[PDB]
Paper text:
To understand the molecular interactions between DPBA and ENDO-WT, we solved the structure of their complex. However, this binding mode is rather unusual compared with the binding configuration observed for DPBA bound to the active sites of Orthobunyavirus endonuclease and the influenza PA Nter. Indeed, DPBA binds the first ion through the carboxylic group and the enolizable α-ketone and the second ion through both the α- and γ-ketones. The γ-ketone is flipped by about 180° and forms hydrogen bonds to two water molecules that mediate interaction with Ser46 and Glu50. The phenyl group of DPBA makes no direct interactions with the residues in the active site. Indeed, in the holo structure the ions are coordinated by three residues, Asp88, Glu101 and Lys114, and in the DPBA-complexed structure the ions are also coordinated by three residues, Asp88, Glu101 and Asp118 (via a water molecule). ENDO accommodates DPBA (1) and L-742,001 (2); however, the binding mode is only driven and is predominately mediated by metal chelation.
The endonuclease domain is at the N-terminus of the L protein, a multifunctional protein that includes the RNA-dependent RNA polymerase. The synthesis of mRNA in arenaviruses is a process that is primed by capped nucleotides that are ‘stolen’ from the cellular mRNA by the endonuclease domain in cooperation with other domains of the L protein. The L protein cleaves and snatches the native cellular mRNA cap structure through its endonuclease domain after ∼11 nucleotides, and uses it as a primer sequence for the RdRp domain of the L protein to synthesize the viral mRNA. The catalytic centre of the ENDO resides in the N-terminal part around Asp88 and should contain two Mg2+ (or Mn2+) ions, which are critical for the RNA-cleavage mechanism.
Residue numbers in the entry:
A (entry chain A): 0 to 182
B (entry chain B): 0 to 193
Write the structure that this text describes.
């Protein structure tokens, strides 16, 4: 556990590119001491790498601060009340067009298509609200089939995931030592 | 000394506020291994906390990327060629007025007043160059007498500085040991290529 956490921190500091948009989540990760919290912030760190790559590939701004669509519009001088709470992975306002980006990773075709339709529906549900406010929605769903990203060599991506999986294994191995113990 | 470095890192992670403007320098600091580089980046981290604190209390933008005044103007579409190279600690363009901020810490009254005059002159020397380009300079010099800032509790600021000083003492001993080493003689002798 201590060794796994140490190896994870070393990968984070030495083998994830120092793009400044990642620095906050790296610090969030490096600050964690509890295994369950290392795992949680490590998955989030991997996710941000994917999100920022998707934003750069899709031509918009990564939603670094988890702003809502409401805030993004207000931020740009656009009133649109009653908009449900939607926090996109990326966004870009060009003229009257609001690009909204959702991205994800899934590892089987069934889970891929399910999440693809979920994120599509999530953005689609504010199209008409945006249209009433003069904003044409440009919704983008970028589904990935693995965790490959431009900020990490493939071998270090793999080692990071292998190490996170060991923390998962220990948790699950922990409670089967709970389940054959208990009541 | 490994323990001192570890303590500085814990203070950085646990007691320096998670302001997004500090992310880069905090990460730069946490990645250092060599005692002297830990010391330099730790001092730079503390300086960054004060500079950003000053920008916030003076109502302007911290100069996150060390942009020059010329660069700040060309980003807002203002031409102005001349300009000496000047990197303010903070800036804000409002209407036709360019706020420029310099901040510093000094620990004696004589050094405080000397530095205040220096920074005041540094900014004043471009007032007319800006006025020709249509810009009213609003120059601010924020001189501080201690290291307090809003991103660190007072006790942690004190203990961070205490541990940096102990790390200074340790790296001074590393240097003296190094100057007794063959590596040092080999560095001297590499004077085969002046
Ligand atoms: O990025 C997104 O679009 C999400 O849907 C949230 C997300 O990625 C996430 C990642 C890690 C933990 C919890 C949510
Ligand atoms: Cl639809
Ligand atoms: Cl100085
Ligand atoms: Mg998201
Ligand atoms: Mg400065
Ligand atoms: Mg200064
Ligand atoms: Na609605
Ligand atoms: Na238009």
């Amino acid at each position: 556990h201590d060794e796994i956490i140490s190896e994870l921190r070393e990968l984070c500091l030495n083998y994830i590119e120092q793009d400044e948009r990642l620095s906050r989540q790296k610090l969030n990760f490096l600050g964690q001491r509890e295994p369950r919290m290392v795992l949680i912030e490590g998955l989030k760190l991997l996710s941000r790498c994917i999100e920022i790559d998707s934003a750069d590939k899709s031509g918009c701004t990564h939603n670094h601060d988890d702003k809502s669509v409401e805030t993004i519009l207000v931020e740009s001088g656009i009133v649109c009340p009653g908009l449900p709470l939607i926090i996109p992975d990326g966004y870009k306002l060009i003229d009257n067009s609001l690009i909204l980006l959702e991205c994800f990773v899934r590892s089987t075709p069934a889970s891929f298509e399910k999440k693809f339709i979920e994120d599509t529906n999530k953005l689609a549900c504010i199209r008409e609200d945006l249209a009433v406010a003069g904003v044409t929605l440009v919704p983008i769903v970028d589904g990935r089939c693995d965790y490959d990203n431009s900020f990490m060599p493939e071998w270090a991506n793999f080692k990071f995931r292998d190490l996170l999986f060991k923390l998962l294994e220990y948790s699950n191995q922990d409670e089967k030592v709970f389940e054959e113990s208990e009541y």
